[PDB]
Every structure is written in structure tokens, then in C-alpha cells.
Write a protein that binds this ligand. Structure first.
Ligand SMILES: Cc1ccccc1-n1c(Cn2nc(-c3cc(O)cc(F)c3)c3c(N)ncnc32)nc2cccc(C)c2c1=O
Length: 835
């Protein structure tokens, strides 16, 4: 069985486990056994969970960030159902009580405590339970706003337990730090030079030192000493030595980093061969500290670390052993002059005692190239009060490379709710890329959270799996996924089923791409359907959890409704239906291969976050933050928003249609009227107005560009939403400041088809202003999350200029009054542009 599980982990993660063995690497070996133990202990805990706790693990609640309500309720093993009038303020227990009383009357009564049950949403992996009014559950809210009757199933605790059960598994060294540069074996045109620097995060620990110049041969020889302007004793624990090999008459060729201490805190010595990474400001301190795995091809640098005595970084116990104030004035950009730094440092105890949230500022002023100073910082850090989540998120930035700081940040982040963790998971995964060692507090934190919440576990898996084609992270991410699989054998098989479906979709899309070059769309479509109706495809593509949202069940693939877009990357449109789910089982996924989906997903997650922040302040802008999930090399899934069309399509203004128009400016309003006749129209126009305000503000703040009428859609409900986000932060395809945008046809709908309607139009302006002012108040959250996202290496999120864009859009250097005046100037400028 162990062999079997080993082969399925290998297949699931995209890497053979024998490849870990072949490295014969103690660090890999230690990571694997330790994390295996950790994860297996998590599994043992899970299998003995109480039944309600099991539900919290496998089906965590979906909550929103008096009134009449009809609900249909049936019991697990029956077609017989009951429709009940309850209240939106009623709790699940009261509803379950009604169900059990009816069951007792219809089926003659003994009878049975509602406390023995939970309510499943029919045909979904989603459950309603807990002391929450029905209107606090997203599902109930969904139905209320869309009009539908909630359909729920009474599921007994013994049924839940069966699910659980079926799913079981030294200061002494004063001399200058020096190295010997020996030789290389590379390819260029000039002479060669090696630049080397010592870094602690972004900060240089002393000036960089450079090689002598040597002719551009294939196997250069230097045999030279590089001495650095720092004492061996002052090397901080997380010191990085960074190399750049380049040609000079400058032509960059390669780079390589390593830690000066190994994973066991031993100071490194003596000889190393550094397999370099090809060069895409020469030195790359944020780059990985592990060598390039393509040793057959990679340029290589051979160096010598001198045996300076075995020496280890001192233990914490040893480390610990070792007037009326402008303080407050400067202490709220955050960049300071040298004298200001001295004051903060001098006043470090006062920072700790009275301004614990200014830790980052203090950290940025400590001299990391002086061991006494670091000791003095660590001493205060070991007694530092826990910080808020927001503050901890900042402390994960590559600017804070020290391991004790890293560990402090994680400690402060443990109070993250699962909902918050889910909101920030993308960024936390990216931060793994900054880690210096395999076994680290971030990795253990994420694994523990993932093992305790199957939804976290699902998205953690896919975030790691989607990057296995990236050599720099393949090893780390492969190891994390293996350990995770050790912690849930059952979830591994659920994930394999998703991977099988994705393998078939890739093969299907490759066929579609070939066929559509040779024949008409109707013909390729019929060929697609014949391919899908093969038993191997019908089986692989049916009965899985959606990778986009594991609570959505993709049951029967609906072949006749599947198609493809006959342009660009030819993405597939795949429809599903589910008898048990009814209408809500009719769902679609888009499979696209050829584009990197990371930027689309990041934009959508930021829009989701805006929607949550707005809703927390009682503002619902009726947004459509649909799912988007990278799954592989320029491959992933996008959630289909049904009953929606593009503005472009509507504006075609085809004849013989319900929307056909005397003036093109009436096409959209006509379309809305056709979908929302009579009294329904007023609601739809309001839905349009709200969502238009949300998207106007979202795209302005994020600097979203390349917006045509084919990348804005509208739902039949009236909700406008943007799709397919290729460009943001003013980087348009170079760097411009994107203005606020008001489109005339949209203003026309908001004004209910009237030329002048200041009453409706100024309401819309008020929504935009409210939305903008709310985001400003959380400005730091967006700044911190985008800073962490720099780890992803998106070309439109690369540097400080990109993050400056958000500082300017949110006008965070301004007062709230000043920011609004400025926003109004932009809104007004945007208004006159409107024809
Ligand atoms: C549904 C529709 C109406 C008008 C014009 C285009 C489309 N449409 C669209 C428009 N579109 N694009 C997206 C979309 C969004 C993304 O962020 C990324 C992406 F690649 C696609 C989308 C979505 N999520 N939900 C609903 N419609 C969406 N996408 C398709 C993708 C694959 C295959 C097909 C046949 C389509 C497709 O027909």
C-alpha cells in the first residue's frame, strides 16, 4: 500500500519521489521525515474529531462578511420534501426542528433532536450549521437576492461520521570575511568579471567587491581572494552571499546566491560549485539560494570558503545574554534621514514599551552588520507583544530576512481566521520563494492550517502544483505537497481525480487547436463532442470537485453544451449538470492553455477583497468576483458566470431581437429591459449602478487597462462586471497613469435612458466616493499584500514604481478630505471625457 501511495503522490505532484532520494541531500531528507511526522500527527487528530468538528474541517462555513423565507427541506435517503415558511432571522436549529416535527407527523411519530443534524445545500459540499441566523449564510443570502428557494437536506450525525471514517489514512572571529574565487565554465562574446556582495535581505552588509577582468573563454580561471569590509563575527545568521557573472567590453550572463550559514547554523566552509541561473542591478539578492538544477547546461562558479577555526551561530540564550520628544512626529512613506534613525535606535525601549506597532521601523534602523546591535534588537524582540495581523503581514516582506523576525511574524499571524487566511493565501505561498531553508516556520504554519481546513488544503495544493514547471521552486513545492499528501491520503485521491480531468482537458484543447485551423467551428465542435463522448473522457471529466471551489460538485459533463472560443488560445467552455443540486448544479468552467493566469487571479482576488471591505461597512456593490485558478504551466480554470453577455455582443444591436434599437446608445438599456420586464427593471438598473460604481473604483485604484467592450460583461440581473485582466498598475500593453473612466453607454443606463438625470447620476457618484473612501482606510492592507506579491515575479509587479502606483491611486499621503477633492477632480475630468 505504501508503494501504491508513493506512486500516486508522484503522479499527483508532477515529480517522482525517487528524485528526492537521488539528491542524497541531508536538508531534503530531514525536511521529509520531520514534515511527514508533523502531517501524520495532524491526520491522527483529524480522524477522532467530533462530528461537528469534522464538518468544520471538511465543510467550513460560508458566512456573509424580520423577513419571510420559504425553504425546501428533505431528509438524506428520501425524495419526499417539505416547504417551510421561516424567518431570515431564524437559526438552522429552528428550521431543523420544523423539519423533524413534519417528519414525525407525515411519518407517524416517536420521534429526535435537531442537535443530531446538519443541513447540506442540495448537491453541494456545503453545510449550514452553528448559531447563526439563516441570513448570515452566503447560500441563504444568495437565494434571497436572486429570488430562489433554498433547497436543503437534513443530514444525521451518523452519516457525517461515516464520511470521517471512510476518509482515514563565534564573536571570536574578528578577521575580514573573505572568499576565494576559483573558476567558472560559461558562454559569451569581451572580458568576464564576477561581482559579489553580502546581503541581509535587500540591504548590503558592506560594499560589493569585484573580480579582476579575464578574457571571455568557456572555463575562466581567477584563483583570487575577495575580501569584504565586515568581520566574520558580525555576519548575521541570514547573511546571503550573492554573485553576478557578466561580460564587459555591460552584458549580464548569470547570477547565484547562497547562505553563509547552512540549515544547521554551521558557518560554511570550504569549496562550493555554484550552478548559476541565467540572467534574465546585476546582483539579485532576492533570488533563490539553491543552485540551478540544470547542471548539464548551467554555467558554474567554483568558490572557496576558508575553514576559519566547526563554528555555529550562537544560541538564543547567548544572544539574549549579550528627554522630551520628535520621536512621535516622524513615527507615522516611513523613510527617514540618518539623524532620525539614531533617535529611533537610541529610543528602542520606548518603541517597545509605548509604540509596539512601530517594530518594522525599528528593525529597518538596526545595523544588521553589527552583532552587538543585532543582539540588542533580538533581546527586545523576544519580549515584544504580539502585533495585529496587518502589522505581521508587513513583517513577511523580504525586507525582514532575520529568522527570529520571521518567527515573530508567524506567531502574530496565528490569530488569522480561516477566512482571512484564505484571503491572503496567495501571498503567503509566494513568500515561500523568499525562504532561505526548506524547514521553516511559514511552511509548517501553512501545512498545519491546510491539514485542519480542507478548503485551505485544496487551494494550498493548487497554488503549489501550478508552479511545478518552475525550476527554482519545483523542489520546495514538491516537498510541501508530498508532506501534505502524507497528512490526507483521502484528499490526495480527490485531488488526483481533478488532475485526471485537467490532463484530459489539455489533450482536448490541443485537439481543438489543431482541428480549428483545418475546418469550420461547427465541425471542430462536433469533433470535440465525439472526443468527449469517449468512455475515457466521460469518466475523467465527470464526478469531481471543482478545482475552482471544492464545494461545487461537477457531476455530469454536458457534452452538447460544451464548446470553444474560436480565437486566440481557443479556450474551452465546459458545462456540467447535477440532478441532486437542481438549477444550482448547472455550472460551467473555462479551461485555457497558453496564458499565464496568475495576474487575472490576483486582480480578481483583490476585487474580492474590495467587495469584503465594502460589505464590512454595509456597502454591497453587487460585484462578481468569479473564480480563477492557475493549475499548470500557462494552464488553469476560470469560473463561468452564466446568464451574462459581453457589452460588445449587446452593442452589435442585431435585428430580430428583443433588444434591437433606434439609437445604438439604447441597446444596453433595451437588453436590460428584455431580461427584466415591468417592475423588475428598476432593480436591474440599480444592480447596474452599484456594480458599475464598484468596477469604476476597482479599475481606477488597480490601474487596470486594456478595457474593451469584449472584456466587460453584464448579467441578466443587471450586474456589470469586468473579465480577463491582463494589465494593471498603469502598465498597459508602457507605464502610464490611467485615469478614472466613465463610459457614456453606462452613464446612459444609470440615468434610466434620460439625457439629464442628476438625481440618479449623483447617487452613482456617491457610491463611487463611498467605495473609494473605504478602500483608502485599508490602504495599508493592499500595500502590504502587493509588496508580498513581488515574490511572484509578475512583469507588471516587479519594483517600487509598481507599488507607488497604488500609493498614488489611494492618495495615502493625503488627508481624507484632500484625497476626496483629488478623486473628485479625476471623476469630473472623467465625466467630461464621456463623449
Ligand atoms: C459567454 C460569452 C458571451 C459573449 C462573448 C464571449 C463569451 N465567452 C466568454 C466570455 N467570458 N470570458 C470569461 C473569462 C474571464 C477571465 O478572467 C479569463 C478568461 F479567459 C475568460 C468569462 C467568464 N468567467 N464567465 C463568462 N463569460 C466569460 N468566454 C469563453 C471562454 C471559452 C469558450 C467560450 C465559447 C467563451 C465565450 O463564449
Amino acid at each position: 500500500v505504501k508503494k501504491l501511495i508513493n506512486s500516486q503522490i508522484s503522479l499527483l505532484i508532477g515529480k517522482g519521489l525517487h528524485e528526492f532520494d537521488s539528491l542524497r541531500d541531508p536538508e531534503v531528507n530531514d525536511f521529509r521525515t520531520k514534515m511527514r511526522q508533523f502531517c501524520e500527527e495532524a491526520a491522527a487528530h483529524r480522524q477522532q474529531l467530533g462530528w461537528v468538528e469534522w464538518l468544520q474541517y471538511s465543510f467550513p462555513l460560508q458566512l456573509e462578511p424580520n423577513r419571510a423565507l420559504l425553504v425546501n427541506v428533505k431528509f438524506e435517503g428520501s425524495e419526499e420534501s417539505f416547504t417551510f415558511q421561516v424567518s431570515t432571522k431564524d437559526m438552522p436549529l429552528a428550521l431543523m426542528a420544523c423539519a423533524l416535527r413534519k417528519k414525525a407527523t407525515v411519518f407517524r411519530q416517536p420521534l429526535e433532536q435537531p442537535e443530531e443534524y446538519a443541513l447540506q445545500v442540495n448537491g453541494r459540499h456545503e453545510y449550514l450549521y452553528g448559531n447563526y441566523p439563516l441570513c448570515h449564510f452566503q447560500y441563504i443570502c444568495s437565494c434571497l437576492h436572486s429570488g430562489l428557494t433554498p433547497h436543503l437536506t437534513m443530514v444525521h450525525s451518523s452519516s457525517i461520521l461515516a464520511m470521517r471514517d471512510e476518509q482515514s489514512n563565534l564573536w571570536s572571529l574578528e578577521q575580514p570575511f573573505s572568499i576565494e574565487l576559483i573558476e567558472g565554465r560559461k558562454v559569451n562574446a569581451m572580458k568576464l568579471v564576477v561581482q559579489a556582495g553580502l546581503f541581509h535581505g535587500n540591504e548590503m552588509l558592506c560594499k560589493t567587491v569585484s573580480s579582476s577582468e579575464v578574457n571571455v573563454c568557456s572555463e575562466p580561471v581567477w584563483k583570487q581572494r575577495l575580501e569584504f569590509d565586515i568581520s566574520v563575527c558580525d555576519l548575521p545568521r541570514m547573511a546571503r552571499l550573492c554573485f553576478a557573472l557578466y561580460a564587459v567590453v555591460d552584458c549580464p550572463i548569470a547570477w547565484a546566491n547562497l547562505m553563509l550559514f547552512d540549515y544547521k547554523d554551521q558557518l560554511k566552509t570550504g569549496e562550493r560549485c555554484l550552478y548559476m541561473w541565467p540572467s534574465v542591478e546585476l546582483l539579485n539578492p532576492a533570488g533563490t539560494v539553491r543552485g540551478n538544477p540544470n547542471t548539464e547546461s548551467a554555467a558554474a562558479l567554483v568558490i572557496y570558503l576558508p575553514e576559519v577555526a566547526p563554528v555555529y551561530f550562537p544560541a538564543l540564550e547567548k544572544i539574549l545574554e549579550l528627554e522630551e520628544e520628535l520621536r512621535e512626529i516622524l513615527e507615522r512613506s516611513g523613510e527617514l534621514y540618518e539623524h532620525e534613525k539614531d533617535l529611533v535606535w537610541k529610543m528602542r525601549h520606548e518603541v517597545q514599551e509605548h509604540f509596539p506597532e512601530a517594530l518594522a521601523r525599528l528593525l529597518l534602523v538596526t545595523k544588521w552588520n553589527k552583532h552587538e546591535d543585532v543582539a540588542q534588537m533580538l533581546y527586545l524582540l523576544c519580549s515584544w507583544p504580539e502585533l495585529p495581523v496587518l502589522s505581521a503581514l508587513e513583517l513577511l516582506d523580504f525586507s525582514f530576512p532575520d529568522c527570529y523576525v520571521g518567527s515573530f511574524a508567524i506567531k502574530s499571524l496565528r490569530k488569522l481566521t480561516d477566512d482571512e487566511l484564505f484571503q491572503y493565501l496567495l501571498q503567503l505561498v509566494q513568500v515561500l520563494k523568499y525562504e532561505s531553508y526548506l524547514d521553516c516556520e511559514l511552511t509548517k504554519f501553512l501545512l498545519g492550517r491546510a491539514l485542519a481546513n480542507r478548503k485551505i488544503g485544496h487551494f494550498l495544493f493548487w497554488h503549489l502544483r501550478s508552479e511545478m514547471h518552475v525550476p527554482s521552486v519545483a523542489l520546495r513545492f514538491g516537498l510541501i505537497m508530498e508532506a501534505y499528501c502524507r497528512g490526507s491520503t483521502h484528499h490526495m485521491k480527490v485531488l488526483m481525480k481533478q488532475g485526471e480531468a485537467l490532463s484530459k482537458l489539455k489533450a482536448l484543447n490541443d485537439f481543438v487547436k489543431v482541428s480549428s485551423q483545418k475546418t469550420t467551428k461547427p465541425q471542430t465542435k462536433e469533433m470535440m463532442h465525439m472526443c468527449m463522448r469517449q468512455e475515457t473522457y466521460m469518466e475523467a471529466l465527470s464526478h469531481l470537485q471543482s478545482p475552482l471551489d471544492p464545494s461545487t460538485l461537477l457531476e455530469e459533463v454536458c457534452v452538447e453544451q460544451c464548446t470553444f472560443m474560436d480565437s486566440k488560445m481557443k479556450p474551452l467552455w465546459i458545462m456540467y449538470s447535477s440532478e441532486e443540486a437542481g438549477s444550482a448544479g448547472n455550472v460551467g468552467i473555462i479551461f485555457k492553455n497558453g496564458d499565464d493566469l496568475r495576474q487575472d487571479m490576483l486582480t480578481l482576488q483583490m476585487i474580492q477583497l474590495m467587495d469584503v471591505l465594502w460589505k464590512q461597512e454595509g456597502l454591497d456593490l453587487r460585484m462578481t468576483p468569479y473564480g480563477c485558478l492557475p493549475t499548470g504551466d500557462r494552464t488553469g480554470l476560470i469560473e463561468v458566470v452564466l446568464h451574462s453577455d459581453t457589452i460588445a455582443n449587446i452593442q452589435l444591436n442585431k435585428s430580430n431581437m428583443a433588444a434591437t434599437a433606434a439609437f445604438n446608445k439604447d441597446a444596453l438599456l433595451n437588453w436590460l429591459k428584455s431580461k427584466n420586464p415591468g417592475e423588475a427593471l428598476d432593480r436591474a438598473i440599480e444592480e447596474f449602478t452599484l456594480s458599475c460604481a464598484g468596477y469604476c473604483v476597482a479599475t481606477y485604484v488597480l490601474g487596470i487597462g486594456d478595457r474593451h467592450s469584449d472584456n466587460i460583461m453584464i448579467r441578466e440581473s443587471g450586474q456589470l462586471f469586468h473579465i480577463d485582466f491582463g494589465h494593471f498598475l498603469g502598465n498597459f500593453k508602457n507605464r502610464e497613469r490611467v485615469p478614472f473612466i466613465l463610459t457614456y453607454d453606462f452613464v446612459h443606463v444609470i440615468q434610466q435612458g434620460k439625457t439629464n438625470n442628476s438625481e440618479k447620476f449623483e447617487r452613482f457618484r456617491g457610491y463611487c466616493e463611498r467605495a473609494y473612501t473605504i478602500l483608502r482606510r485599508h490602504g495599508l492592507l493592499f500595500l502590504h499584500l502587493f509588496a508580498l506579491m513581488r515574490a511572484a515575479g509578475l512583469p507588471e509587479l516587479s519594483c517600487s514604481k509598481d507599488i507607488q502606483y497604488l500609493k498614488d491611486s489611494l492618495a495615502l499621503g493625503k488627508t481624507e478630505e484632500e484625497a476626496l477633492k483629488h478623486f473628485r477632480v479625476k471623476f469630473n475630468e472623467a465625466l467630461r471625457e464621456s463623449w
